[PDB]
Amino acid sequence: LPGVLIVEDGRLAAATLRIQLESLGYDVLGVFDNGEEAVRCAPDLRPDIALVDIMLCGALDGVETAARLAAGCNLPIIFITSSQDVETFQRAKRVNPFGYLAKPVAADTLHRSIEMAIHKKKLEE
Amino acid sequence: DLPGVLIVEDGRLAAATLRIQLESLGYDVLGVFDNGEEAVRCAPDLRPDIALVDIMLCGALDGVETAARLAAGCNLPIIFITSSQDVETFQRAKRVNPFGYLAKPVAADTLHRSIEMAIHKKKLEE
Amino acid sequence: DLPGVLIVEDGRLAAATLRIQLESLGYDVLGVFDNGEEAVRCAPDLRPDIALVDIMLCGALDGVETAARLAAGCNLPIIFITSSQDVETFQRAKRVNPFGYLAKPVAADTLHRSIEMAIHKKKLEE
Amino acid sequence: DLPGVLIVEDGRLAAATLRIQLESLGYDVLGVFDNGEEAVRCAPDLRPDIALVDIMLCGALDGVETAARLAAGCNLPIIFITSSQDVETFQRAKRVNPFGYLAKPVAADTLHRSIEMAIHKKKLEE
């Protein structure tokens, strides 16, 4: 079977991909949540392809993990992105959330958003 | 008298960072869920004051449907956690020269097609 | 290219205090108005990114009606500046759907994050 | 929008089949070329979104150098149509970095998914 390496920050996302690949006759060789140990364990695993989360953060981010996988084990890379289109924000609008916090979230902004959100609810009700 | 926070976040680093941040600032982290279905089910028993919900969610319910149910069945204010995928990450990614890009959630049909195309490509080249 | 803030505030010292806080944060304050009718008149010309409205305005248009018009006709996000506790006015304020409520004396750091978050929410949802 | 496709193919049945497959999928076929020299000359003015080029062509310019000039000159994603399996023409083809290689006979859904992934890769990396 063609061997697949997965690098994915999301717990269920990594799992979903594994199960999907395995339902289609693939052999998933390693599933990693960080780039350094993916790049470290990949040579002694010899995969045919790497699937990499473009939005991976940490010691090695998504792009630099892929770069080192492509140069190291001579792997082709497929990047896994989010489908964050304006259409999803149109559906999000309808639930009327307090607002949106982009990753990585700052502590000050996190606290202030939580407290103005709770205060808005209290005042309006 | 800690305000109680429920978090729906699949990302291991974001979910761990947000626990740490919130527990420092003086909040009760009531539960962290990697899917919307569990979140919606556990929430009335947890009685949160607020939900932090990632807009990108694998599982039955997407992030938006998850927040809609948390705003209704549990009477919660919602803050969405969003991604930071700027053009600058795709300019760096170009330099890797990847085979391509697949948006989450990926259909197993598309996933299988792209892999077989990518391997066979790599065979013919270096 | 920092955001353009429009202030609607009856108390002249509070307006000034607000202007001081906003200028110290870096924001450009485009106009300060004490009656709501003329704020709505000037709004399309000076093109603000956000409007800070005193919920307790009286006269020609009240705070709620001034914000209702700015929010709908100029597509401005609204933060209400509050002092009193009249439940009835917070009911009508709900209907303009403001971003939040800031109680005077306003802390600058809350002011800064509210404005950032209000404009950001507006950007994504457009 | 459904992309504009340029075809460079000297096999007359292959050329015909490709033109039919694309049009039945919706695509607008902008031009069909027997030879690379004239493909490279006419393509900047056609303004294609993608080129399907046979890896082997008769004339002054082979497949590999037609596609190299089409990719570098029109900022164009290139899919190669292959049969042939010559080792070092592929090692030269690597240096064009095409989206991929489609072995004849080409399944019309393999072609569709290659074109949509080739364009999306370029759009994202833009």
UniProtKB/TrEMBL annotation, chain A:
The keyword Transmembrane helix does not apply. Transmembrane segments: none annotated. The keyword Ligase does not apply. Keywords: Phosphoprotein. GO terms for molecular function: catalytic activity. GO terms for biological process: phosphorelay signal transduction system; regulation of DNA-templated transcription. This is Response regulator receiver modulated diguanylate cyclase with PAS/PAC sensor. Residues 3-118 form the Response regulatory domain. The modification 4-aspartylphosphate is found at residue 53.
UniProtKB/TrEMBL annotation, chains B, C, D:
Residues 4-119 form the Response regulatory domain. It comes from the Bacteria. The modification 4-aspartylphosphate is found at residue 54. This is Response regulator receiver modulated diguanylate cyclase with PAS/PAC sensor.
